[PDB]
Amino acid sequence: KLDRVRADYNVHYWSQGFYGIDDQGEMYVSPRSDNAHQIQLSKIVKQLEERQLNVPVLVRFPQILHQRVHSICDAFNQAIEEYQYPNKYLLVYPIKVNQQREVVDEILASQAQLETKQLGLEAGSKPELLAVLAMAQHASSVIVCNGYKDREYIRLALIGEKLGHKVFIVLEKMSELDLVLREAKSLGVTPRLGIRIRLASQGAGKWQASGGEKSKFGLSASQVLNVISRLKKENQLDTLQLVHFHLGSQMANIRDVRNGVNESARFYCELRTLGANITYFDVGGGLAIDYDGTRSQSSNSMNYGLVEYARNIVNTVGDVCKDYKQPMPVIISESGRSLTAHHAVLISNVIGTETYKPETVTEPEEDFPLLLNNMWRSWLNLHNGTDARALIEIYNDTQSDLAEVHSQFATGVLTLEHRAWAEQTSLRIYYELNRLMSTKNRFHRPILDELSERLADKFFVNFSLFQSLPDSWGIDQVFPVLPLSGLQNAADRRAVMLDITCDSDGAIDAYVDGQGIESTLPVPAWNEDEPYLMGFFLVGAYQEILGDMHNLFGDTHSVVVNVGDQGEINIDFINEGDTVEDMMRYVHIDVDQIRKNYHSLVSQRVDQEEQQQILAELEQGLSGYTYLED
Amino acid sequence: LDRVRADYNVHYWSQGFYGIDDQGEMYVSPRSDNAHQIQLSKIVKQLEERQLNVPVLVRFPQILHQRVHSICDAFNQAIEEYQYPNKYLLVYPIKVNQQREVVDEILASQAQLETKQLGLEAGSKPELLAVLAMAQHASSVIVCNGYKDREYIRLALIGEKLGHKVFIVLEKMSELDLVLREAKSLGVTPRLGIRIRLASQGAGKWQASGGEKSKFGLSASQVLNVISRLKKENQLDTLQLVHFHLGSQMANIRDVRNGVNESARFYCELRTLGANITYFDVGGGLAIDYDGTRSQSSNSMNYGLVEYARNIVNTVGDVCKDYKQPMPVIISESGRSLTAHHAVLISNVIGTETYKPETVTEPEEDFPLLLNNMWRSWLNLHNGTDARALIEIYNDTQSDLAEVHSQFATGVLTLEHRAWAEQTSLRIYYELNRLMSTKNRFHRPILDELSERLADKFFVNFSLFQSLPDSWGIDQVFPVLPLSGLQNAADRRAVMLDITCDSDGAIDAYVDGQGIESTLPVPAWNEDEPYLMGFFLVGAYQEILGDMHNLFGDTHSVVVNVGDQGEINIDFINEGDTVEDMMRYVHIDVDQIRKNYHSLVSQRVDQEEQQQILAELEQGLSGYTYLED
Ligand SMILES: *Cc1c(COP(=O)(O)O)cnc(C)c1O
Ligand SMILES: *Cc1c(COP(=O)(O)O)cnc(C)c1O
Ligand SMILES: N=C(N)NCCCCN
Numbered sequence A: 001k002l003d004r005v006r007a008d009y010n011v012h013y014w015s016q017g018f019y020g021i022d023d024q025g026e027m028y029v030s031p032r033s034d035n036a037h038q039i040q041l042s043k044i045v046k047q048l049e050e051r052q053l054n055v056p057v058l059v060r061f062p063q064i065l066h067q068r069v070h071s072i073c074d075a076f077n078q079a080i081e082e083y084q085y086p087n088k089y090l091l092v093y094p095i096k097v098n099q100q101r102e103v104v105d106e107i108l109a110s111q112a113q114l115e116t117k118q119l120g121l122e123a124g125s126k127p128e129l130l131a132v133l134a135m136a137q138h139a140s141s142v143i144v145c146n147g148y149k150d151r152e153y154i155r156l157a158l159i160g161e162k163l164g165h166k167v168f169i170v171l172e173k174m175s176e177l178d179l180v181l182r183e184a185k186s187l188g189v190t191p192r193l194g195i196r197i198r199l200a201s202q203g204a205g206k207w208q209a210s211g212g213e214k215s216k217f218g219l220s221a222s223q224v225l226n227v228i229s230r231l232k233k234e235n236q237l238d239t240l241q242l243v244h245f246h247l248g249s250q251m252a253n254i255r256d257v258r259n260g261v262n263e264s265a266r267f268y269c270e271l272r273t274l275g276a277n278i279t280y281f282d283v284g285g286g287l288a289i290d291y292d293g294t295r296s297q298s299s300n301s302m303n304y305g306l307v308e309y310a311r312n313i314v315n316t317v318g319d320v321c322k323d324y325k326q327p328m329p330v331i332i333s334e335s336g337r338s339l340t341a342h343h344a345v346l347i348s349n350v351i352g353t354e355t356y357k358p359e360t361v362t363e364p365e366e367d368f369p370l371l372l373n374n375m376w377r378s379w380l381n382l383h384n385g386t387d388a389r390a391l392i393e394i395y396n397d398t399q400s401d402l403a404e405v406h407s408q409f410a411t412g413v414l415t416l417e418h419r420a421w422a423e424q425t426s427l428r429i430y431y432e433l434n435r436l437m438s439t440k441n442r443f444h445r446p447i448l449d450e451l452s453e454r455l456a457d458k459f460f461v462n463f464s465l466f467q468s469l470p471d472s473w474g475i476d477q478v479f480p481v482l483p484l485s486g487l488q489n490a491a492d493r494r495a496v497m498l499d500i501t502c503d504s505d506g507a508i509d510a511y512v513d514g515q516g517i518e519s520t521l522p523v524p525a526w527n528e529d530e531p532y533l534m535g536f537f538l539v540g541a542y543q544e545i546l547g548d549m550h551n552l553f554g555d556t557h558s559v560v561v562n563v564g565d566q567g568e569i570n571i572d573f574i575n576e577g578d579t580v581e582d583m584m585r586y587v588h589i590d591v592d593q594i595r596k597n598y599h600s601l602v603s604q605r606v607d608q609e610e611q612q613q614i615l616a617e618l619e620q621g622l623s624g625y626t627y628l629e630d
Numbered sequence B: 001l002d003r004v005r006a007d008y009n010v011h012y013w014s015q016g017f018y019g020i021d022d023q024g025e026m027y028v029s030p031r032s033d034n035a036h037q038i039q040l041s042k043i044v045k046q047l048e049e050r051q052l053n054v055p056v057l058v059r060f061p062q063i064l065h066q067r068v069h070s071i072c073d074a075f076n077q078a079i080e081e082y083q084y085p086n087k088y089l090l091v092y093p094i095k096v097n098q099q100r101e102v103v104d105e106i107l108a109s110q111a112q113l114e115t116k117q118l119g120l121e122a123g124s125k126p127e128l129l130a131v132l133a134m135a136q137h138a139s140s141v142i143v144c145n146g147y148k149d150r151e152y153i154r155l156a157l158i159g160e161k162l163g164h165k166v167f168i169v170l171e172k173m174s175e176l177d178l179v180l181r182e183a184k185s186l187g188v189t190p191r192l193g194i195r196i197r198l199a200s201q202g203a204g205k206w207q208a209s210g211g212e213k214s215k216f217g218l219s220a221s222q223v224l225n226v227i228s229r230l231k232k233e234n235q236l237d238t239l240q241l242v243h244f245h246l247g248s249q250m251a252n253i254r255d256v257r258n259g260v261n262e263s264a265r266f267y268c269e270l271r272t273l274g275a276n277i278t279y280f281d282v283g284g285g286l287a288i289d290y291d292g293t294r295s296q297s298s299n300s301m302n303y304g305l306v307e308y309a310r311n312i313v314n315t316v317g318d319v320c321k322d323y324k325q326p327m328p329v330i331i332s333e334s335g336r337s338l339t340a341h342h343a344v345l346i347s348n349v350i351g352t353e354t355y356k357p358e359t360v361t362e363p364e365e366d367f368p369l370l371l372n373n374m375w376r377s378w379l380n381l382h383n384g385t386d387a388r389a390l391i392e393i394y395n396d397t398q399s400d401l402a403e404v405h406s407q408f409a410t411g412v413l414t415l416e417h418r419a420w421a422e423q424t425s426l427r428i429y430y431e432l433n434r435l436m437s438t439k440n441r442f443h444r445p446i447l448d449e450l451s452e453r454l455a456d457k458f459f460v461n462f463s464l465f466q467s468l469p470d471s472w473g474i475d476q477v478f479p480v481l482p483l484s485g486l487q488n489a490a491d492r493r494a495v496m497l498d499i500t501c502d503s504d505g506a507i508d509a510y511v512d513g514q515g516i517e518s519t520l521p522v523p524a525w526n527e528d529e530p531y532l533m534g535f536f537l538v539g540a541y542q543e544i545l546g547d548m549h550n551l552f553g554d555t556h557s558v559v560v561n562v563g564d565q566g567e568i569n570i571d572f573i574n575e576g577d578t579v580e581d582m583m584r585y586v587h588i589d590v591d592q593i594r595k596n597y598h599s600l601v602s603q604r605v606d607q608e609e610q611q612q613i614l615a616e617l618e619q620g621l622s623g624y625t626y627l628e629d
């Protein structure tokens, strides 16, 4: 049954209604706001294959970016209406989360459909500013500038203001103020200034600009005061328009958001008190994504929802302004991750497995030692008539017996054959223990968890973790991962997913299912005869940019898919992934020379009939996708 | 003033390739003869004169050459001490660093040791093609690991067809049938190895299936299935190599010795079943001492080079003596140890946040008591204050400051009050740090906290995520040192921050004379003068794991040979990415954008200004992604 499978995965806890399992047992995406047509992801794959693109593939749904833009804006609007807050919310997209022109254009495109009709982007570095200015060349835009600012970064930012953008240069180091004033004078521009504030409510040391605590940016209380003082002196206090703080990405605890906003709102009111007219209050990033579906205060989740995040921000800022009797600023959030995580799915195939097949326990030959007979006797006592206690005993004896076998092999007591026999016999006992024990028995359940790991299939997935999913390796980030098809049989097996790199770390340690994080995943059985497709979801934020070429596996193919009015699958942009030859160039091999040398060597050492064949396979290997063929 | 050399103790991790000379400069000494030390700042000046700015990755192929000879000599010495009756063969696994310039130089050694062999290991389909391309000129030993499809298998067998010795190591049971089929198809006799799963390295590793994450290798039972199938095909002679790999950076020599013991027993058991295994490949694992402490920790190891080699050779030897069997050729795949030292990442410190001593102002008459108490702490803090009173001033001040932050947060204090409190505290810390004594057992740990409280932040012009990825990913420690003016390294303490917009772009730990610290002693930063830092031991796995966070790309890289008379020879130069390179990677049409700027400026900017501005936008696009001082 599919509907019992649906409760085993509980996709809806993490998918936000963008993905689900349909009645044919296929995973779909539903990316349109009218929710009009669902599309089976496997059917998108079938259509890529027709066009000669093989998996792995990264698939983007812009229609999902559009909805996130509207949801985040809707959430703050609701909060504004409920509080009767007397100013606006502005969404601003930090490009660091995902810089791809096709992501950023779709984000810009919905922002234009919004009532403010207000474009907002944030750059965190010189190269990002130039990218941001390129991508907002068409219309006047809010641009917030963060990061380390040299002369050239400041002059480019002022050039942007000259050319008609609203460019906020956020002061993050005290020396930058003096640089901005000089460069603005030199370009004849009226600069717009924001200030980044250091907070004392988020940990020891962060209030301090100097010192060995690692928050890089932001001005001290003292430094903030110096800014106001320097501006008053130059008759430029009106250029300070923006107050900024950034708590960090993926804030799991709503309390920290509240404490942060509380402290910042007070700074904002104190600055107006000293005469500055701050128009904007920018709460930075930090709006988390619920990667594991558990809504918990854990590093892969959050204990709050979208609207509640909005309310904590609006209410706190509003309450602090009412106390000071100050007017309320435009609220900005830089919510990159929330905007981008859901829109992308990585698809690839399971190209082989290592699974345990139950074989027959052969009886001990006269040659076998007591220890191995003991295991044989355990195997005979294991059946439907073995009681609940005695099954546990047999588990414990069998583990101890295998451990002793391993020690005797290591010291020269036992032959390779003895070891083999004991290992296969143990696996047979484990396999049966796993069938005889009951999940309704309280003392069997912990063992059945143990046994579930011990008997899981290894699934080798045609992809590189280091390339497509770097946070998995680097910070034990969890992503939901699921078979795309045949989900009626998801109770068949348990499996762990490994990548095809020659590295221990290219394996997933954690899975998302119906009750949260597990160490293995329930899956349909694999067959050599049918394609078996898997999906990594919530890969939309920070994954693409951060991946690297371990083992010379390169970029995957990527495509943009829009679902049309009548349910068409419009494949709108297509980016081809790396070939082996690309990777060879990247590491400075002269490939044209390699090809030509190959012509010689083959004519030298190969029989004439074969030569064309051998040369074709060499040339073809160079020109192939880095990834493997089933 | 050579307490400086002793503060850093560079030789504890440098292996004699880097040190400080008597002019206060970091030098490299890359030749085996150690004939000429070249100051690393002179390499930078020489690059500056060719229009390349830091950040720069500098690589020294003569260090690679020495690494190959040191590892071979270590094994050869162990072989001679034991009287081990067979040879050692070093095989380089290109996964550690795939650059042609690195691999060439390793290969260029291979040629020169009178046994005149060394090999390459590939661990995936595309590495196999890179290895085949890199050994095109000469016949070679090639070991193939990783997940093998039909194409990988056929390429490997073609490699053998063209004269290489290609060992296709079986890592999965199903891959034996595939090899045998395809070898028949290409009419080639295969050479096979087998990777074996060990039970001595932790629970679950012995098993092929199951949830434990050791990807590759055959279980004892599958090893026997291999023997049985090859006996039936009459192809048992094709199995020539036994393989295992424990993992990289093995810190505990005990694990090495346990792994070798177990695997030697597999080797001798296989011979017992008529297999004629000739090669015994112990994989990687041979660690690098990143912090110079030679301790059993994630960044270091409890053993040395010769010791590693003795543990291998003596263990294989003793077990063989036990079966009365012949000893095999020993192979190690020691990538990391071959490559870590040869490369240095150099960049400049382009700004700082430092605390500058300011006088503490008397509280205004409107100030609350709490801020008066802090004032009173400050007055009681001078050369007359006794040792115990210094600690109590330290504790009152921290308590005061904390209470100030709670009062700001609930509306009790103004920003001006907070500002005054924070600056007074810093002044009190700065003076505590001068009045307390290193000779006093109870000041020392306060001075430890003060060192951090008072450290300079140095902003280095590079991206940790691009150039030192393991530092972010696995808290890899790398030595980091300033390159110049080292006579002055007692000036201050600093932490190094990269210029990315990201909290994680900082180094948490530093290597000084004591091993690992949380700050580094350094010369003072001056705006007027260049300040260069080196990150060392970046040779293995850094270059290829780096990513484009915040759109910072590749740095320049160059290859430097020191000639017989000391000439600095800059033999290859790879240019780093420009802003335009990055924009194009994220699919912006840069040439269209160039054009639209011309449109936009001429329509929006006063005529007398247009050329200036357009020249600035274009110098923006064509410039290195990194910043200018
Ligand atoms: C990185 C960053 C962001 C993004 O935050 P997310 O929560 O990941 O979306 C926003 N603002 C600033 C200043 C950042 O550096
Ligand atoms: C990664 C790897 C190596 C390299 O080991 P290092 O200790 O990092 O030098 C050697 N052999 C194999 C099979 C590997 O996968
Ligand atoms: N994804 C990065 N590697 N780290 C995220 C940091 C962003 C601000 N805390």
Ligand SMILES: N=C(N)NCCCCN
Pocket: A502, A503, A504, A505, B246, B247, B248, B470, B541
């Ligand atoms: N530093 C790399 N990411 N990991 C290397 C692991 C390789 C075999 N243990």
